[PDB]
Amino acid sequence: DLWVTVYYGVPVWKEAKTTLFCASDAKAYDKEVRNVWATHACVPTDPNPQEIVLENVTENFNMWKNDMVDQMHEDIISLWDQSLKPCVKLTPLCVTLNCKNVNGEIKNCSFNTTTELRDKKQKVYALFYKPDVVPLEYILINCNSSTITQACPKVSFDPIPIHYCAPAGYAILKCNNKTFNGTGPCNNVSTVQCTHGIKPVVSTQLLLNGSLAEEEIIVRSENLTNNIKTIIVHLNKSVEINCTRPNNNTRKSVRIGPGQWFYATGEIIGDIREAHCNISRETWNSTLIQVKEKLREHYNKTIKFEPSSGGDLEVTTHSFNCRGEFFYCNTTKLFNETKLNKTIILPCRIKQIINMWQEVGRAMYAPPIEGNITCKSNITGLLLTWDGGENSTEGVFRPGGGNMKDNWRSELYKYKVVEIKPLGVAPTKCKRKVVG
Amino acid sequence: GFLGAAGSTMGAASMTLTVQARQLLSGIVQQQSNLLRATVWGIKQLQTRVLAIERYLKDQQLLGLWGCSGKLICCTAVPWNSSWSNKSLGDIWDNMTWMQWDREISNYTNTIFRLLEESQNQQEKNEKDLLALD
Amino acid sequence: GFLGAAGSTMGAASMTLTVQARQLLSGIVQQQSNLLRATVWGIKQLQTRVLAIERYLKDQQLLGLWGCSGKLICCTAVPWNSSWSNKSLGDIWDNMTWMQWDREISNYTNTIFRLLEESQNQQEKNEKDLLALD
Amino acid sequence: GFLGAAGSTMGAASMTLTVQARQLLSGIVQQQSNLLRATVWGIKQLQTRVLAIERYLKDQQLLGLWGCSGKLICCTAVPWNSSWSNKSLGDIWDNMTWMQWDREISNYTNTIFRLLEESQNQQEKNEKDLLALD
Amino acid sequence: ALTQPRSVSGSPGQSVNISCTGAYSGLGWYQQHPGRAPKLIIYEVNRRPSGVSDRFSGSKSGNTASLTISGLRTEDEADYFCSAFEYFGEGTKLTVL
Amino acid sequence: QVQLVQSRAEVKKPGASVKVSCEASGYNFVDHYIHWVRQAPGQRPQWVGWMNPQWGQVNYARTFQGRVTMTRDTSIDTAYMQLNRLTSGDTAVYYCATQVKLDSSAGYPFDIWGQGTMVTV
Numbered sequence A: 001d002l003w004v005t006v007y008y009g010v011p012v013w014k015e016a017k018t019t020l021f022c023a024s025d026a027k028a029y030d031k032e033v034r035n036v037w038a039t040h041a042c043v044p045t046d047p048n049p050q051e052i053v054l055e056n057v058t059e060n061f062n063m064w065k066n067d068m069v070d071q072m073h074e075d076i077i078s079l080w081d082q083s084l085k086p087c088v089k090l091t092p093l094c095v096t097l098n099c100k101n102v103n104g105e106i107k108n109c110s111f112n113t114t115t116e117l118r119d120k121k122q123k124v125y126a127l128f129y130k131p132d133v134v135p136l137e138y139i140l141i142n143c144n145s146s147t148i149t150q151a152c153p154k155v156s157f158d159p160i161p162i163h164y165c166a167p168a169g170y171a172i173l174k175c176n177n178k179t180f181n182g183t184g185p186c187n188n189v190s191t192v193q194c195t196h197g198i199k200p201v202v203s204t205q206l207l208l209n210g211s212l213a214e215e216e217i218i219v220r221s222e223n224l225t226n227n228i229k230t231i232i233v234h235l236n237k238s239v240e241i242n243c244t245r246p247n248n249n250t251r252k253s254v255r256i257g258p259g260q261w262f263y264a265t266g267e268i269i270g271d272i273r274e275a276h277c278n279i280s281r282e283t284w285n286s287t288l289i290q291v292k293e294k295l296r297e298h299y300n301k302t303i304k305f306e307p308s309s310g311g312d313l314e315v316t317t318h319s320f321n322c323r324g325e326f327f328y329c330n331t332t333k334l335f336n337e338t339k340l341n342k343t344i345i346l347p348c349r350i351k352q353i354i355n356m357w358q359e360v361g362r363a364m365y366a367p368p369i370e371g372n373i374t375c376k377s378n379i380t381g382l383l384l385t386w387d388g389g390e391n392s393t394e395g396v397f398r399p400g401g402g403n404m405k406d407n408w409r410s411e412l413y414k415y416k417v418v419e420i421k422p423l424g425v426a427p428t429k430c431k432r433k434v435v436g
Numbered sequence B, C, D: 001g002f003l004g005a006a007g008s009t010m011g012a013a014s015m016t017l018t019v020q021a022r023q024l025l026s027g028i029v030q031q032q033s034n035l036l037r038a039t040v041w042g043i044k045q046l047q048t049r050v051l052a053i054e055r056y057l058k059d060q061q062l063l064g065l066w067g068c069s070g071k072l073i074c075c076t077a078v079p080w081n082s083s084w085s086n087k088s089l090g091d092i093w094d095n096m097t098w099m100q101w102d103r104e105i106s107n108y109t110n111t112i113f114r115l116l117e118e119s120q121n122q123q124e125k126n127e128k129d130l131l132a133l134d
Numbered sequence E: 001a002l003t004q005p006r007s008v009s010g011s012p013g014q015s016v017n018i019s020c021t022g023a024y025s026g027l028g029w030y031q032q033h034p035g036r037a038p039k040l041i042i043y044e045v046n047r048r049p050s051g052v053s054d055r056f057s058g059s060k061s062g063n064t065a066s067l068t069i070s071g072l073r074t075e076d077e078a079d080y081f082c083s084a085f086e087y088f089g090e091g092t093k094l095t096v097l
Numbered sequence F: 001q002v003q004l005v006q007s008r009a010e011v012k013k014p015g016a017s018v019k020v021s022c023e024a025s026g027y028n029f030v031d032h033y034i035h036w037v038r039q040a041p042g043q044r045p046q047w048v049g050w051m052n053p054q055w056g057q058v059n060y061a062r063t064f065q066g067r068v069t070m071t072r073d074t075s076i077d078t079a080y081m082q083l084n085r086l087t088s089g090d091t092a093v094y095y096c097a098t099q100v101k102l103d104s105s106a107g108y109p110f111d112i113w114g115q116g117t118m119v120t121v
Ligand SMILES: *[C@@H]1O[C@H](CO)[C@@H](O[C@@H]2O[C@H](CO)[C@@H](O[C@@H]3O[C@H](CO[C@H]4O[C@H](CO)[C@@H](O)[C@H](O)[C@@H]4O)[C@@H](O)[C@H](O[C@H]4O[C@H](CO)[C@@H](O)[C@H](O)[C@@H]4O)[C@@H]3O)[C@H](O)[C@H]2NC(C)=O)[C@H](O)[C@H]1NC(C)=O
Pocket: A032, A156, A158, A159, A201, A208, A209, A320, A321, A322, A323, A324, A374, A375, A376, A377, A378
């Protein structure tokens, strides 16, 4: 007859989300308290990741209802606050600064700070950038909103690849479609131990240092024809950028308390030069054309570009970190032409008092880096927003980086967390031996 | 490998059920705490380890109350009420996958799970106690 | 329901032991952490979850060392020394509740638990090894 | 007592394996949290209890996948390939300790552990399903 | 290019029924009481937000959004607007005899 | 609670600038986008733009591009909309719109609207 027969270890799963887990690469070369994403206690990963390719099944995906990008964004915020917790407060630095210009974008400010003695007062000088100072005869930009905790010079903001790993009893489903839309079924899925190398970068309008595409450029958004969500244009090829801060800055240690040391920008020597980035001209010219071909597939007419209309300074420019210093690069020179080595040079301005995530609370002060600064932007994606209610002849895609979950959705679109239910009931012709 | 036979037929998948059984808990090859460093990651890690044991111990508990603790495949003597599924033997084990099976009978699985604990193992043990009395 | 037969006779209570067995660990139907919000309650909760596994695993461990892992009712071959209790069969199973039984023999239960691990399962396994040698 | 027979011969040590088995988890006789006080010691303590569960549950899981969950001594039907060890019966059980055995065969135990889960319990269960079909 | 008629007849007990054609037409419908701001009555052509009566409902078609209200009252005399993302319709005034 | 309150109605001269504020209370002001939509008294309602209060990230139609600037003050949960180069054809009632009490994450349509600010110029 047909009697139940329970099987333990059946390959059936349910859509359910759990708590992920960091597992960095076997690169414990620390030698100093560093790696604010790994911090102290992120475990080594598997040297041989057991990537297990599946066939025979089509499972649907939803990269905007994914809970991994909510959990990753909560961790990076939590790592940001935890690394700044033992760092030096800048409470006694919120005094009237006496700033005179250098010529420029640097203001020579002299302020009034208590020494380690609670009665003696000293007068010291420092170099502060223009958008770090608001008029009042000057103060810091956000001393009347919240406190400032400077970044500890020991730690590093270099994003190392971290693998978000589901615990025992769960699995991560990796979609392997070469041209994969995001929302919708995936014909070729593979369960993995956990994710690939994910660099937790911070960047607006330009997804830096990520995963590249294989076949062509995939244009990704929730609805495309909706103007309210940003469009993630995931690139196939990657352009080369050489960003720099080509002025020689000296780091000045200002005594502000017992153990609390305030590292300001000392005397600048050499040439007063602007920070710039070279995003080729030939690779970007071919990059925008291949972006136009994919954007013309979802439309029927010409499509033009135009720089960002407004907002705060950190979205109208191209923000990132370049060797412990935060840049703000004017990307008007990029999205200028209207489509259907002679390099373009982006003027970038440097800020030290940065208020990342716009959460009311800690807004760190990046200490200056001694000497020249050079890094390697790489671009594996773009962040574009559609324009409003308009004529059908042409449309504008303004660049824009909204909530930071769009940065993680460019790398967490492939993955999905499901729970494993190894108990399963299925009738067969077998029956156990009767008692009587 | 783990979940490798998720798209295969039930007959092919039923041969490699040990693989999914192993990886549900371990766990301890990848880490033990780890006590090589001595944070957000520490609290996050620990809550996952408790959950992995707690979910695992539920299944062995359910298998235990069905008298199937030691085995991965056990047969029972509760009959299959046809209202649950009307499909035959050849329409289930050689043409359908486990994923589509769970979707259709999930409404009454709890009542089926009630039949596995009451109908057999609660009756078999009382009868087996009455059988070994002599 | 859970602990429902605490005042009933041992014969009536012995039929619904599965109900009390389910609730020692679960647990995970009522909550998983819960990760819907993402404090004193967090540390307190986790220590409860660890403790519920510690008590549950001890009982299955004790049942395991008595060779009774899979079953809720198992019979042995250690004889009942009369010094523990002088009561007969009809004076125990049809006139007393489990609450009043535990009160009187709790003094010597520990060496009874020592008899269950030594007298049978440590002797039965050595004999069963010598029995399947041929 | 616990690990008392670590220097004795395998035959003498095999009689008191229950003593070493009891102590991997407990645990709960020495403490439960403890909720009599209500720190560095609290976090350190909790990570010990989780670790004690997780390693213990690996061994019952491995014993479970070999169909030996309930027993401390179980015999199988996978034959012993001589490449692992060339020693005889009398050269092992009455002249050698368990310590020196683990050092010499630890290299291939993993493919032995693969033989215990595949060769028997994955074949025995498919055959046992085909046996109770009639 | 999202159009709708201006006035459709009705009576208490008889249904008032509005067409609205266009691309992605009838994503949301608003009942603008004369004097204050409009209020959502249905979203996603057929779903019902909280705070509105059960008699408010909508039916979907290929390109025309049909808003059907059954059991009219004298207090429902208002202007109805059909919207599609950022676009909007012309506006339909209720007519109850 | 979970409501939008606007400023008083204003009547100005051509060329001048008007600031129509919309303070929000009772809910997460930052997490939800603030849309602005017009309605001429005798014409279909026309949509101006949206502004999410995280960084501001303002979006405009070309019929208002270069004329309207939307700023914010997130410390007091106030969303602004300032029009420049006012002409004769810029008369309407100005509404601030958002989406809070809906289960649709698509951002459209709107459910919570302000008290209204009739601007005649
Ligand atoms: C996107 O990804 C690219 C990688 O393709 C990143 O580019 C690299 O960024 C890292 C970190 O910003 C750079 O690494 C740093 O280089 C500094 C300069 O190196 C020169 O000087 C050192 C010392 O003299 C030489 O050994 C070296 O060969 C070079 O000549 C180093 O000074 C840095 O060292 C750090 O650690 C040491 C040890 O504690 C400290 O003493 C230092 O003060 C410092 O803290 C560091 O190694 C790297 O050079 C970049 N290029 C390449 C090709 O890897 C982009 O930054 C990244 N962008 C974003 C936005 O994520």
